[PDB]
Every structure is written in C-alpha cells, then in structure tokens.
Amino acid sequence: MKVITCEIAWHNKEPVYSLDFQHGTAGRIHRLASAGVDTNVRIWKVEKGPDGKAIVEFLSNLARHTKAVNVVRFSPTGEILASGGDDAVILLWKVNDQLNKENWTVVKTLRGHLEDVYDICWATDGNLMASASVDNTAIIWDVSKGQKISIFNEHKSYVQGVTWDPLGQYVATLSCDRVLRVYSIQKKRVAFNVSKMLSARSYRMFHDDSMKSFFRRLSFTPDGSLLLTPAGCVESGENVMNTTYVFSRKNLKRPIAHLPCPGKATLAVRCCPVYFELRPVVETGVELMSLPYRLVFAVASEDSVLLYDTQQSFPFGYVSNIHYHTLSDISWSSDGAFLAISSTDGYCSFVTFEKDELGIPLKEKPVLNM
C-alpha cells in the first residue's frame, strides 16, 4: 500500500468532484473520468508503473458542458458513461470508432432535474438510472429509452446521495434535512424513512445543513446486504460527534452499528466491487457482518479516507493530511488495486494496492438474488 499525491494538471487547477473507473474491463489497465467546474470531462489512462506507482495519462476531453459538473459515474458495464452538470441536463456517452486520442460522443439526452445535479446512480444492470440534484427531487430513468419514468418529491431539503440496490429491490436516498428514505422498486414509494432515533432520548442521527460539506455520497455494498450512511451524528453526551451508520437488510430503521470518526466529517462512502476470502481472525464480534466472503470499502471524510473490511471494526488502512482542501470523491478500480482519491483542492491522489495485499479475490463471484 503506497499513497501517491497527484501533482499533475487535472482540470487546470479547478477542483475535482467526481471520478469513476472502468468496471467492464478487469485488465490491469484502467480508463478514468473526472468531474470539475471547468465544464470539462477529462478521460485519463492509469496503470501501475515499473516501480508500481500509479502513473496516469490523459485520454480524451468533453467540453459540451455549458456549466460545471458534479457527479460522474460509468455504467456497471462501463461502456456507457453518465455525465451530470449544473446546466440541469444529463447526457450519456459512448466511445466512437489533437489532444484527444479518442472521441466520446453523447448517446442519450436525459433531463428531468431542471437544477444543478449532485448525484447519479446506475442500476445493477446499467439500464435503470438514478440521479440526485438541487431540486429536492428523486428521478428514475430508463437507459434503454432515455425518458423519465418516476419522480419522488417527498424531500424538504437538498439530496446529496442516491444508490441502487444491487439486488434491485431498494433505492436509498438522503435529504440534507438529516432525513433518510428508502424506496421500493415495484411500489415506487418510501419503503423506509429514518431521521431520528431513541437511545431513551431521541435525536437526529445525521448532520444538519450547517456542515461545510458539499456532498453526502454513499453506496450500497456490492453484496447488497449492507447499507452505509456517512455524515452521522452520535450524541454520546451533551455534544454530538461525526460518524457513519451501517445498515443491514434485516432492519433499515435501526443500523447495526456506526463508525465514529473523530475530528472531520464523512461525506462519501464507496465499496470496492471485488470480493475476498475471510481473513483468519479470532471468532469474535469485531466483524461488522458475518458473511462467507468478505469485502473491503473506502470511506471519504472531510479530509481523511479510511479502509474497513468485513472482519474488522477498526480501519486497517488509514490516510490523512494529503489534500489541502476537503475531499470530493473516491473511486475503486475494477480489480480494486487502484483507489483514486479526489478532493476539492484541485488535485487528486492515488493509493496503489499490490496484488493479494487485500486477500484472494473469489474464484467465482457469488450470485446475487434478484
């Protein structure tokens, strides 16, 4: 595990906000896209150098954006990319067969949030689309036809994170009003809605609008049995403290536990899409969930990023004091060996993972019950 601060010109010093790897190809080589206020989407090629360093190179640029972009995520297939800017429109791109080695062309023209967009989510197949914006609205799109199908207006404040159940039965959304909602697929309504919890004094678990954070990103576990929510509040005494909550499919009202994070505040939660064998450890309650196969995920705080696995409660991987400004986004490589760190300073950073450093990836990927 080695951490590389990226000193290269990313968006000619404009801050980064979103980034994504290529899930379709499991090869060591990776195609990386980035989000900045230059209204420019820049594709970059990354791979380990001869010294193992994650060295990067430009690939192509997108400049159609009349406005700044906030969230950028590829399809699970990775062949088609979702692009979202302040100009209140989302275009879909596919590579087409002086400074752009390849041309990437808009494929679909999706609107429905008529405001700045914060978050986008792909389905478990890449044919259904989830997106989050200023507009306090949750939208649902069909990638195949590229038209709006659903609108959820129950939110009172801004929504900074949406995610799709990999099983395909839930949609999880948060408001900036310290309110969390889970949505069914067939029912298309608020399956779950949690904002306050009794201890038995009752108080809200999430941080108010007073936070100096811009994004509240979170993701389903690729297994889909664990739900992770950053920007949590734990009031142990007269004070409240930053944390993130972990939820299981058994109950989405009461999280299984939480991870307190002294100092800075969590803003983004991402899970590596690869599985690993159960690391040999004493049979205790240290593990967050007991599963036949383990998984490792990254959490983006205000400044720090922390690494947790299925067996351990304390973070095994800890990094801090690397980016001067607050964090913006975190991305996992398809192989999981590249963990791309993006902040709001204007640069990114990488942490290279050697093969098997995080365990043996499963020989056969366990199926997910739809």
């Binding site: 290269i8 010109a9 990313w10 000619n12 430009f58 640029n61 400074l99 400004h325």
Partner: protein, 109 residues
C-alpha cells in the same frame, strides 16, 4: 584631494494550461490571507442595505459577511491582473475603464 561637484535636485485570453506537465503548487492561494484591507463597516452597511433592498426579515453571520469580503477582493484581483495583461497588450500602462470592461468580457460576465 578629489574635485567635487554640486549635486542637482532630483524630481489566448483564457490562459488554460495543458493537461500534462502542470504541477504548480501555489500554497498561499490555498489559505485565506486574513488580510481584509477593507473597512469592514462600509462594506457591512452596504450589504445590509442592498439585502433590505432585495428582501426583509433576514439575518446574516459575521462568517458569511467576511466570506462575501474575500470573494469580493478575490474577484478584484482576478479582474485586476486581467486588466494588467490587457493594458500590456493594449500597449499602455495607465489603466482605463474600457480595460476593466474588456477584461470583464474576456471572462464573459
């Protein structure tokens, strides 16, 4: 010794940088200058009055007001060396209001 003498009285516009080979690490621009260099109170009164102009029954925070401040002079310096480069290209050193307008349009405000 040495003969002495009496002294006499003495009287392209977007400079975007290419995606590669750009590792500029200006650290000063990261941190706030903590150097207001503006009289706080005319600024505050002006903000209060224009706010009343727009809407009423509203309150501010000193943090928000000071933030407004550095936003102000940050935009000032940006436009300001923009005008400097314009006037140098304009083959002149005395700054004209047309220079401000031309730089303003260079950004596209």
């Amino acid at each position: 010794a040495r003969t002495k003498q009496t002294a006499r009285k003495s009287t392209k516009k977007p400079h975007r940088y290419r995606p590669g080979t750009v590792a500029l690490r200006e650290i000063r621009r990261y941190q706030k200058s903590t150097e207001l260099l503006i009289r706080k109170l005319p600024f505050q009164r002006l903000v209060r009055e224009i706010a009343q102009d727009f809407k009423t029954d509203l309150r501010f925070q000193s943090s928000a007001v000071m933030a407004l401040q550095e936003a102000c002079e940050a935009y000032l310096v940006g436009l300001f060396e923009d005008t400097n480069l314009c006037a140098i290209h304009a083959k002149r050193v005395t700054i004209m209001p047309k220079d401000i307008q031309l730089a303003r349009r260079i950004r596209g405000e």
